[PDB]
Amino acid sequence: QHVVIGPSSLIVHFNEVIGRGHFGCVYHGTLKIHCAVKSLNIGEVSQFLTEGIIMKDFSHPNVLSLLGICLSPLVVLPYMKHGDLRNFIRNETHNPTVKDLIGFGLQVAKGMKYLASKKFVHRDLAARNCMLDEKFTVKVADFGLARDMYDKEYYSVHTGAKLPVKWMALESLQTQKFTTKSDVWSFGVLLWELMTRGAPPYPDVNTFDITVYLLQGRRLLQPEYCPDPLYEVMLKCWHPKAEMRPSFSELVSRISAIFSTFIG
Ligand SMILES: Cc1[nH]c(CC2=c3cc(S(=O)(=O)N(C)c4cccc(Cl)c4)ccc3=NC2=O)c(C)c1C
């Protein structure tokens, strides 16, 4: 009852599109609070409503909240003024510093520390999937009922599942199974995105050949303005043994220390 929003309360403006996914579409909406409304133009209804209960109960400053569900069902989400983290760091109008970028990474880690503590596996962590609000607070997003595929370029087929190979751990590429430890691998790649200001990872690699490229003894290179301790953290995130990768709690700890050494 706490998850359901009355159809009287929501106005969804289909003329103004925020983004087009594969399975649905997200629009500007009004609830007076400005929101984003995900349409699903099917799946089990039982599993849908129970997923919305888990999601609604997630409350963390660095995790995207679910405002609610309007009864195809409509998923109501907060409005995020500055859009996704990747586009934000690529914008020629914005000037984040090295400290700012490490800080964005710290916020994500805190968001993921929160999600990991609820035994929730994100599966698609990447800068494109983190959103910023008006206070430039980074929110880990595109999970649960909100989950879709918006930048088709970064997902590759084959089970004919369409997967973000360039963000995936070795074992996930082999087994197609995702864990919090494979989320940790994705977080290392996200750290790399931040320090290169939204560069595509492994440009001259194609698709599932990534496994062969990694097994060559390769990792993403250190960005110029990435601090040495931050690069060492990335390498730990990409440990070949999943269980030897740092927890998000350890990552929050290590990154908060690096962050604190910078001014401005
Ligand atoms: C001004 C603005 N807002 C947004 C996106 C946006 C959300 C994305 C999400 S999401 O990461 O969970 N998600 C489903 C999503 C992920 C990528 C692209 C898009 Cl359009 C949506 C959730 C709430 C949002 N509120 C928003 O305003 C974008 C991409 C822009 C340019």
Swiss-Prot record:
The modification Phosphotyrosine is found at Y150, Y154, Y155. Changing Y154C: In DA11; not phosphorylated in response to HGF; severely decreased tyrosin kinase activity. Changing V108L: In RCCP; germline mutation. The modification Phosphothreonine is found at T207. ATP binds at I18, G19, R20, G21, H22, F23, G24, C25, V26, K38. Residues 238-264 are annotated as: Interaction with MUC20. The active site is at D124 (proton acceptor). Residues 1-264 are cytoplasmic. Changing H28Y: In RCCP; constitutive autophosphorylation; causes malignant transformation in cell lines. Changing H28L: In RCCP; constitutive autophosphorylation; causes malignant transformation in cell lines. Changing L115V: In RCCP; somatic mutation. Residues 12-263 form the Protein kinase domain. It is found in: Membrane. Expressed in normal hepatocytes as well as in epithelial cells lining the stomach, the small and the large intestine. Found also in basal keratinocytes of esophagus and skin. High levels are found in liver, gastrointestinal tract, thyroid and kidney. Also present in the brain. Expressed in metaphyseal bone (at protein level). Dephosphorylated by PTPN1 and PTPN2. Residues 132-264 are annotated as: Interaction with RANBP9. The kinase domain is involved in SPSB1 binding. The beta-propeller Sema domain mediates binding to HGF. It is linked to Activation of MET after rearrangement with the TPR gene produces an oncogenic protein. Defects in MET may be associated with gastric cancer. Belongs to the protein kinase superfamily. Tyr protein kinase family. Receptor tyrosine kinase that transduces signals from the extracellular matrix into the cytoplasm by binding to hepatocyte growth factor/HGF ligand. Regulates many physiological processes including proliferation, scattering, morphogenesis and survival. Ligand binding at the cell surface induces autophosphorylation of MET on its intracellular domain that provides docking sites for downstream signaling molecules. Following activation by ligand, interacts with the PI3-kinase subunit PIK3R1, PLCG1, SRC, GRB2, STAT3 or the adapter GAB1. Heterodimer made of an alpha chain (50 kDa) and a beta chain (145 kDa) which are disulfide linked. Binds PLXNB1. Interacts when phosphorylated with downstream effectors including STAT3, PIK3R1, SRC, PCLG1, GRB2 and GAB1. Interacts with SPSB1, SPSB2 and SPSB4. Interacts with INPP5D/SHIP1. Interacts with RANBP9 and RANBP10, as well as SPSB1, SPSB2, SPSB3 and SPSB4. SPSB1 binding occurs in the presence and in the absence of HGF, however HGF treatment has a positive effect on this interaction. (Microbial infection) Interacts via extracytoplasmic residues 25-656 with L.monocytogenes InlB; MET can bind HGF, its endogenous ligand, and InlB simultaneously. InlB probably dimerizes upon binding to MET, which encourages subsequent dimerization of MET. This is Hepatocyte growth factor receptor. The chain holds residues 1067 to 1346 of 1390 of the full protein.
